[model samples]
Target: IVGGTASVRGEWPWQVTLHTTSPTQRHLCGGSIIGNQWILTAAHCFYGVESPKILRVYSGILNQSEIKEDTSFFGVQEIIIHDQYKMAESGYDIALLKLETTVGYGDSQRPICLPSKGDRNVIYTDCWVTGWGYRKLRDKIQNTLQKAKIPLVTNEECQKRYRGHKITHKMICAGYREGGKDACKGDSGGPLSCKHNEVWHLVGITSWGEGCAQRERPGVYTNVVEYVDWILEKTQAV
Candidate 1:
């Protein structure tokens, strides 16, 4: 997360790190635990990937150093991306991964909730995005997870700066209107989590951004609300 601070352990336990050994780009994205066997991430995170088995998920962990341990990594059984998903900037940026085994529901690992169908009236703002973004090519991957409190900038308000580009109803613009506080360079597929009624829901998936924390260029995310039904239908029951 850009313009953010280090997150304490257990603060964002739903967060997971996605890494593929063969990819030229590793550690460019993060994911969320939606269930013991399901992971929510951006579809673009699998670019050029021929198979899902190559991907590994790091869960119940806080430091990157800890990921080196065999217990920290989990195998992926399947990768399910939205059928209509086009470019990263296009709509339906989400994807769900089925793990070979179940993760845990302890203080170190948990699932973020999906918004209820009857909760459409709620307008979300003031959400947090967490990730261990790799800023540049070959830069050392950040060891600790970071969190940023960026509010939801409605597409109507955000469209002004994003002329000629589409911020579809299935996407969101999150950032400080003035400047600063963003998902940064490579936090893609990370969770844009929002808390309500004392529980946090997976509101969005970090999709794209113009430039890290620039004025009027809010980060784009796949609206998790829009894909709630899709997620339910695409994966197995807990």
Candidate 2:
């Protein structure tokens, strides 16, 4: 791993993986290359779960197959999950974690830039997504992060497709119908980002999807813009 401070804009896609006991183990949730001291991901990755020690944030890797079997892990000092997360409707699905020590980004560790407020929606209407979650139904989740570029769908269109849900201000949409491009089952909490005016902005964090790379239904993400203040406040407080 190259050792140094990772740049947010410099790192196009960065992320961390978390493991839960027994049937809950998963990996490859995207996170923006945020700060030397912080990683921004969906809180649902850690909600109602203990054992943050099992989580590991691996930055600077593209293909999950290339990741080392034994890599240095980042210790989670504190994780602030949304205080109002709703299980049924999936509410307040954003979270941030402070690393015990800075994970220097040189070749391997880098951060991504966050859009100001709603800039990602307006600015990054089309973006790419990367993760190491579930592969096509027959395959298991890969050990390394797998990435794919996807377009950003408008809130109105997303709500229209998902009849049970409305594309609220807190959410953003991306994917292809018939499920060709998307974040799969294990990709929850990963990152969705786009480049605008030569700067990469964090557009979304992987939240939920019907299947892995299914056509038609696009992947849904937790709107980072909606939780910026909460994220800033929580990080500052830490």
Candidate 3:
């Protein structure tokens, strides 16, 4: 998002754009549709927010400037944040949104697959992060969704880059050692998708990074595999 080109419509079926209900209709964070009425995102997106009534979720749309026939919107019914989510640094920065209305799967809208029970040990080498976040640091959010291919970096290697910060098991790093590609401010809570057996899996939720595509400081994300069980339990209860 921070440094990427515009994405094609429906290219990322699971992508969800979070927006404020104010008259300005500003975009907030990015998210992934994990179920018919459940969304996965970062807890820090609404870290200090008190209510979900003012937020809305938009799916099946690429360019916010152009409203297509396939564009779908939903109201937020509830929000469930991780119990251990104290801050971005402490890790466990994940959340689930219960949509007031259910979304149907079609060409422009769909849910991504979470890691299966036996697929926890799998490693995703090549992954992509897509969002409507800024194309550059401190820049305005783009109207069209942007995408970039960022390879997954090991925690050990990532920790070396981010020496002062703590890299926990609940987090995953992705980007180039040279930088120039990553998720930015408004891209928080977006999906980091990786393909396995031709099926795309939700590998990470865009969390934090040192800066927009800075050298050696790859973007960090909330590892979806580490919280799949918690996600399942919450979604099932709904």
Candidate 4:
């Protein structure tokens, strides 16, 4: 996150760190646990990857320091990207990861609820984005998870800034109108969640942004509500 503070342990338990190890133990992107065996993220996260087996999932840890008892690792069995997603155009920007084995849920590890079919397209006000991504544009990724509250910005308002660019209906924008709190590099594919009726819902998947946080250039996200059916179609079948 650009302007954020350290998140407490188990605060965002559903958050997952996605990465590979052969080249190096690098943290590539962020994701959210949507089910015991299903993880949600951005399709662009695995853009050039040839194999899904090389990716790993880490959960139940506030920081990426030494692994703790509460932390667990899962092997990626499959990487399912939206068929219509296009890297050149940057649309549809969503994906799901199938785990090799189902994971157990507890306080330190759990799945976030997807918006009900009837509730899809409902905009949320108090949304938050969490990640261990960069604090600056060109800096090393942080070890500790950082979180910040970023209010939802309508696409009309977001589109005005990036003229000529296509901000599709499948995507939503979020951030302060003044431009401060926002997601940065390596934060892609992370969750942009909102709470309602005391239950937190996976509202968006961190997709793209112009800079860290610039006026009228709020962070864009893959609207999860629009893809709820697509998500269930993939996860439920498996």
Candidate 5:
């Protein structure tokens, strides 16, 4: 959705929403609004080692309006889970979906720009993590999209803080190490965008975490930099 934060003229472009009819559906992931016809979401969004035909892509929602509104819908045409994705370590948890037809952007659906020219390697930078995820001390998910500015925590900091897994160069950390606000279940596959100069650049996509928001357990995101070449190749082939 277009907001006072990022300025991308037209409408919010390249946004996508994955839907499922299965009774167990859950979470709000981060995604990049790439070209007119495709969305860059995480591979887990379409697969759990199963085919993706059962998954659906809901487009045309600007903010939270499309949650209940039906403007455009696309059945899973193809699910391209990253070939190198490792479920156990959460490596390459990214995925992409091709739509039936390209839809036009509206006030709520415009494309945000992606990073170029080695924008990913910069360290301890900040980015914006937006989602319709959970709010403070609330079990119910939010309707309107909410945003919080996050500083990219160093991989060393991530390793020092997180207990189970090691934070690789493939991932970035954001949120309070002390807890409070962070992305919840519904916030997955959403964008963790960085602002450079006057433009918004997607540096990461929300991937996973425990509970909603907890201490020393902030949201983990798919490092956009490590997969930049793959993203370009895949998106171009589409």
Candidate 6:
């Protein structure tokens, strides 16, 4: 979210903040509420730890510091990261978290619509990424949620941008050629949503990038469209 604007409290209802006692660069990540008891995020966010007790999922809030007893924070009951998720450059950077209990929706929280398993090959409109990531390269993670609309970079164009680093079909490239806006380090596991017939679909999951908004290095996200079946089998959400 390094170049995005501050987001409205309830603007992206599905957005959630992923926190753990474990440490990564920030020890925090992003997620989307896919069901009352399920969350969608990046596998790297778990960092090989599958212990549900170590993670907490926070929803229905805009500012992280204002989290209180009634702020809809819940313990993780289970973690389901893709089995083929490591040591290679293929698909499967996604993970699903089963919450200790079902979550209630509010103006600030709800499940984002999952794309149909057959929704691939259809371009989405008004695609955006939201997170509590750094607003600048030198700053720390932003306490307030931030959001920005970035164009979806085609696989062909993305391959041109990243030669050796394969831009596989499992990845979705998003950002500008000159690079002024993007998801940064703390933005991983956040949602990349787009509107289709007015309801927002979970289009992508923030995964990686060259850095914070670098030129010709658009942000890379785990394409959610192609993983609907996995999510369905993992959670029986559909």
Give the TM-score of each candidate.
0.93, 0.82, 0.95, 0.95, 0.81, 0.93
Show model 1 residue runs off by greater than 4 Å. Answer: 23-25, 134-140, 236-238
* 120: Cα error in model 4, Å: 3.3
lDDT tens digits, residues 57-133, model 1?
98876777776535557789999989998888777899999999999689889999998877666877659988887
Query: What range of 10 consecutive residues in model 5 has the weakest lDDT sum?
Result: 1-10
Residues 123-199, candidate 4, lDDT per residue (tens digit)? 67778999988897888889999999999888788788778888877888898878888999989999998998788
Q: What do the candidate models score in CA lDDT, each in turn?
A: 0.83, 0.66, 0.88, 0.87, 0.65, 0.85
List candidate 5 stretches off by more than 4 Å: 1-14, 23-30, 48-53, 60-70, 123-126, 136-138
Clashes of 3: 0
Rank candidates, lDDT, best first: 3, 4, 6, 1, 2, 5
lDDT of 6 at 185: 73
Best by lDDT: 3
Candidate number with the higher lDDT (2 or 5): 2
The sequence of per-residue lDDT tens digits that candidate 6 reaches over residues 1-238 is 8778888879988998888756531338899999999999988887667578878788876888866545547889888889989822455889999999889987878899998876786778689999998877777888789999999999999889887888898898999999999998788898999998788999999998777888998888898988988898898844
Q: Mark the regions of model 2 whose C-alpha exceeds 4 Å error after superposition.
A: 1-13, 19-28, 63-70, 118-125
Q: Write the residue-wise lDDT of candidate 5 on 20-134 in tens digits.
A: 6565543335466676766788766655436555556665554555455344566656767899886714668777776667757776566777667466555535577766566
Better of 5 and 6 by lDDT: 6
